[PDB]
Amino acid sequence: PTVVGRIPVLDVRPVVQRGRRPAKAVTGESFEVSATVFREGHDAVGANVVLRDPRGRPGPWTPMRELAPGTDRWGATVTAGETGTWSYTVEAWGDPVTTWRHHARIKIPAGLDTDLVLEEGARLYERAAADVPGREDRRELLAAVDALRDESRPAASRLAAALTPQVDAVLARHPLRDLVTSSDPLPLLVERERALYGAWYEFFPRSEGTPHTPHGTFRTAARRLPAIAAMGFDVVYLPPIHPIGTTHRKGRNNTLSATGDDVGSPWAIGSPEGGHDSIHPALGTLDDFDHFVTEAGKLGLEIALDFALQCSPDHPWVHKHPEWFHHRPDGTIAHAENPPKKYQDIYPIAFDADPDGLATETVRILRHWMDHGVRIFRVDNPHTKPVAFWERVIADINGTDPDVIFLAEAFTRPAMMATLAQIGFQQSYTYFTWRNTKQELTEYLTELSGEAASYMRPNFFANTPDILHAYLQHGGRPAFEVRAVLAATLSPTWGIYSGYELCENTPLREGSEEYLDSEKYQLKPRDWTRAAREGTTIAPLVTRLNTIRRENPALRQLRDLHFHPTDKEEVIAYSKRQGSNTVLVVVNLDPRHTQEATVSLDMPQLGLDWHESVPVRDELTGETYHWGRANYVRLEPGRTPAHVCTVLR
Amino acid sequence: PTVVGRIPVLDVRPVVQRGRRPAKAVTGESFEVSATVFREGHDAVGANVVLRDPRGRPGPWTPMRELAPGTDRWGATVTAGETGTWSYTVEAWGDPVTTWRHHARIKIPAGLDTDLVLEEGARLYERAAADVPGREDRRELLAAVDALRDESRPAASRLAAALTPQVDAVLARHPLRDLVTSSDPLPLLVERERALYGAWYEFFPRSEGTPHTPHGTFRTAARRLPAIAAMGFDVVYLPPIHPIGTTHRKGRNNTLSATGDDVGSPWAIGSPEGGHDSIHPALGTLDDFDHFVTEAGKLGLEIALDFALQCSPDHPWVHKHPEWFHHRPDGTIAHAENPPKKYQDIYPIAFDADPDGLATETVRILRHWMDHGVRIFRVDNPHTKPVAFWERVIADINGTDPDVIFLAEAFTRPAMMATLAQIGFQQSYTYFTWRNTKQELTEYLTELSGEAASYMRPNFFANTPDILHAYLQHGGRPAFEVRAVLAATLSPTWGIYSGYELCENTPLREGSEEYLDSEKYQLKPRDWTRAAREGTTIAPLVTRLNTIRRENPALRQLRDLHFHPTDKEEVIAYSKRQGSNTVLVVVNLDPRHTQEATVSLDMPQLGLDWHESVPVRDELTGETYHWGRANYVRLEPGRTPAHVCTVLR
Numbered sequence A, B: 001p002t003v004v005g006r007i008p009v010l011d012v013r014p015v016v017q018r019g020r021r022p023a024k025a026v027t028g029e030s031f032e033v034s035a036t037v038f039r040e041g042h043d044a045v046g047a048n049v050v051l052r053d054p055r056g057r058p059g060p061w062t063p064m065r066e067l068a069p070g071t072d073r074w075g076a077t078v079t080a081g082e083t084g085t086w087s088y089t090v091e092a093w094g095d096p097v098t099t100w101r102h103h104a105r106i107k108i109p110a111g112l113d114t115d116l117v118l119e120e121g122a123r124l125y126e127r128a129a130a131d132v133p134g135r136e137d138r139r140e141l142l143a144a145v146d147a148l149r150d151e152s153r154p155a156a157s158r159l160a161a162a163l164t165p166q167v168d169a170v171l172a173r174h175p176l177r178d179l180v181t182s183s184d185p186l187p188l189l190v191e192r193e194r195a196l197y198g199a200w201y202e203f204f205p206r207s208e209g210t211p212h213t214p215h216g217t218f219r220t221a222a223r224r225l226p227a228i229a230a231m232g233f234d235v236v237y238l239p240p241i242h243p244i245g246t247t248h249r250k251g252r253n254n255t256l257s258a259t260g261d262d263v264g265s266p267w268a269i270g271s272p273e274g275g276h277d278s279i280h281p282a283l284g285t286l287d288d289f290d291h292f293v294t295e296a297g298k299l300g301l302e303i304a305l306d307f308a309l310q311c312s313p314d315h316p317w318v319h320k321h322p323e324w325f326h327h328r329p330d331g332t333i334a335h336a337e338n339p340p341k342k343y344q345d346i347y348p349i350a351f352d353a354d355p356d357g358l359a360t361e362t363v364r365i366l367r368h369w370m371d372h373g374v375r376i377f378r379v380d381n382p383h384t385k386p387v388a389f390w391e392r393v394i395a396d397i398n399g400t401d402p403d404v405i406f407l408a409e410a411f412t413r414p415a416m417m418a419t420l421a422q423i424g425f426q427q428s429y430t431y432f433t434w435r436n437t438k439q440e441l442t443e444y445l446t447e448l449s450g451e452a453a454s455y456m457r458p459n460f461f462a463n464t465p466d467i468l469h470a471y472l473q474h475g476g477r478p479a480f481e482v483r484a485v486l487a488a489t490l491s492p493t494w495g496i497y498s499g500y501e502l503c504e505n506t507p508l509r510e511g512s513e514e515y516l517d518s519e520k521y522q523l524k525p526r527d528w529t530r531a532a533r534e535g536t537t538i539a540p541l542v543t544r545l546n547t548i549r550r551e552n553p554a555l556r557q558l559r560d561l562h563f564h565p566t567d568k569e570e571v572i573a574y575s576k577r578q579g580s581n582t583v584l585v586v587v588n589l590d591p592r593h594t595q596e597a598t599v600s601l602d603m604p605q606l607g608l609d610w611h612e613s614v615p616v617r618d619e620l621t622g623e624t625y626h627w628g629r630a631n632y633v634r635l636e637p638g639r640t641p642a643h644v645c646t647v648l649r
């Protein structure tokens, strides 16, 4: 048996790890299936994509087209439906009718063997009709056959009868396919909308306390939820909610020794009060948590818990499962590290003595929180645990609970970042915060929206508690407005960490991406009411961006994204499209100086002619404009970061 | 089970059609095996390639290195041995000694728990020692262990004893490998030297006749062979040697009607005198052919026969196996075409009524010629026959006779050309004749010497009976010298069609790549004795190039090729290396004007640092130079087309 079929179909894409891991999509997401297809000789080929759902039912007739002349690369868009494991194949075939038409349209007007040519056509349309299931449709073709064979009409008339729009339509839906050859099926994992699309908000419950009780509880923290929902977020991500170790607890500003009532780092998990399946006592009880989750749920907010597979020296695991740690010759366990960062308050897990016990316990813990309504987990530093461990854990959980979403916080090298997504992580943190110039953004988003979109779904946090980028530090509020627009419009999932709205941008020191007085090591109460009254919050802009996202399907997908050229280095322009919805964004990346630019739109990329001019509405202001192949923009930092326009019909 | 192992090993290359076809090499050929290798956490990894021969026997320890900082892409060079089907895997592992050494070199000078660190080292070296086979190497490690543990000594001395060259050498041979993880085996097809390396000469036996008998026989054509061997060729490629059809036989200069004794095209195979398993009666008998093959063998020449799977209308198959042809409704068979070329003298084969019958007869025919010493077939237009037909035919023949070499004459789109190589064609014709500027040559050869070399072996014919490129038409003798040097030094396999050495360069008409009075349609007697006497032949240049090739392993491989910058667009420079053999070539692509240029060698690519100066000898003249990072050259058409230098020892 041969590797290549009768009509060659090769290199079907997308493909992940040569077909051993599934490509990814979510419900309603479109993406391109492509292949290299050609045949021997000079005649025509056709091709089509067969997408099969988890029960094996094929989707609609989905013909492909050659994507560029002379390349033999064919593609078609398919759209993912219900969640589950799908498969797709590419079918290739000889296309004799197209070939016959090409020749017939030439030889008949030249009077060359017209009777032979027309009879050959009749025979083709007959074979075509044989496979047409609808009775009026076969009759349409047989009428063409009979007209083709009618020697009493002029040849040109005989041919025209085979080329009518009604014949074309039957053949469009039921073409005559010679020597149909199929690729081997490739797997597709379709997951729920939220895996691709959502707005995230991170905050520390303990910071939302009272004058009398500064350490917030789930009961008090629940008060922030309406404000978070009102800003248009969908997911609330909480730092670890478990007891915190006392041994080597870190003090304020990441100092080595905690003093007094210092609350320590939430990531330093575990004490006699309990481990990863328990609640920090100052946060309250499990019932309080349930209350928080229920209240979050009523406002359209899902909870994402941090899962940080590591232990303070006081975690129960240290004595219950010593073999889950690497011990030095004197029995001590070296603290964890992420060079040059040091985590003196914690132990790393060792995986090679009892990998099974660790997997069993990990999925037990996850299922515990899942039983209490948590269907999303933000996994802390997954790249310092074995890759196959996450592969196994995620497969175990999604096997029983496929809706659970895992988000990889892996700020590391590209191979590891990609592999984690490929072995099952639904979402990935990305290099976004370190992409701030037009070139960086353009290059990086081209990567994320390109081939990588086949296994990775990016979550654009404009800040995190560990990342206050120099761009925000130097740019102030105008920089925050810019990054929110970018994050919100370039990825269907974005997030901010509480305080971003207030443009908090004081670094620990010059050259650091840490916050001064970081919330990681201390309660950080915020005057939300005053900022609202004094207009010193960009919460309304954040709110508008999420509203715009909620109203424009184009911003709820990733793969359709195109950058349009501008004549200023500081001004970036791009469009995203989903069906009839087109959003075009123009952003001034300069947070300090007004920039004027001409934006030259790739009109055909927008589905338009070059001379054409179209109505747009700037969704940030309500202004209406008419934009064409060359558009003037003037963006003044502080007054306006960007135009976020929808194309009006 | 997980798809990823304990230590990730991903995307092993070379790979062809995701592992469904073998990558290729020939005996003695080196190539790079690469993989993506990394681990969780921050500790070091190591990797190595395990290349296994047809009996499953592993090669030597072949450690890999990271190819570029931060990429996690690792590679090592391997070398193919005996012919057959090999396999290769990549092994990845934790490298605890490298990890420990890095930390120990830092922690010991710092005074940070040095006893603990040294004891950790002792335990490692004990582990390392346990696997070590050598009586003396193990005691070397165990001595380092004792020195590490000697608490009566200074920390620095204790550490230093673990870092001696003696210890480095032991661990370099027998490293301690943690958590060894293997990729899945990939197939490697190793074939005989001639598949990659050889010089080809195409000529028509019928043209080598006599005054008294103009149409050559195999006995007269054998007298041309000594001159051919003397030019340093290894392979003689003969156009089809079968009876030639009379129906619709073509006349001189590709005219529609043969007249008188026009001999017709050899590619119009078949008459009642016989088909593809027969000899043209004017060429003689099978005994005469056997004599011809024997004479070829005495001179070190292999015969390559043209295999053209097509028929004149007089071929016995036409009526014996009508279903091997596509018939029009009036019963006629349309002549073959290669648009805009027309082949009115032949019918193309149809493959889908009796594919088994066709495959069976094809391999019967090939095996017939194989039994008479033909171990190479030049396959005419394989791309108008099914790709899977060739995969089947080649698999059948090489299954019993793995030494047989198939050369694909497919001048077509890249996908088909590549696919034919991948499904089994040992060699491919290329775009070489249409690559004549420095940029064209540079780009094209970068492609051929890169990833494609894992599946395609190029045969650079500077001309064919169908291709007289304008460069040769316009440039005369100096252009022939140039393309000969280029062809001979850029590919380990190259060729010419007889008359090339006489600088035959008269086109059929301007703008054509056909020869006037093409040998395809008439006897083309050439006065070889006179041309040699009068010095109107570049046979001596051809002879020198093949001698240089026979003497320099660098010119007998493909993948090591580097282009070096020059300051004149018309002057190209490149190097090839194999072991200690380095060849440096500089060619003046201008056939009409003397060119002076500076050649700036990338000295590290030659294995030299930038200030070094090296002796070279131009093997075309015997002149010796001293060349360094910047070298003056002056190349004069008709006198010095190029420098072909070997680096002297």
Ligand SMILES: OC[C@H]1N[C@H](CO)[C@@H](O[C@H]2O[C@H](CO)[C@@H](O)[C@H](O)[C@H]2O)[C@@H]1O
Pocket (backbone or CB within 6 Å): A250, A254, A265, A266, A267, A268, A269, A308, A310, A342, A343, A344, A345, A346, A380, A381, A409, A465, A466, A520
């Ligand atoms: O997603 C980033 C988070 N993943 C790190 C390790 O768990 C977190 O480190 C924090 O938590 C650590 C342990 O509690 C402290 O040692 C660090 O100083 C502190 O920054 C960090 O916030």
Ligand SMILES: OC[C@H]1N[C@H](CO)[C@@H](O[C@H]2O[C@H](CO)[C@@H](O)[C@H](O)[C@H]2O)[C@@H]1O
Pocket (backbone or CB within 6 Å): B250, B254, B265, B266, B267, B268, B269, B308, B342, B343, B344, B345, B346, B380, B381, B409, B465, B466, B520
């Ligand atoms: O390697 C290219 C060769 N593959 C073509 C088809 O067999 C060859 O065509 C030749 O042979 C044909 C059939 O005899 C003629 O009709 C053509 O005019 C003649 O050029 C051509 O030499």
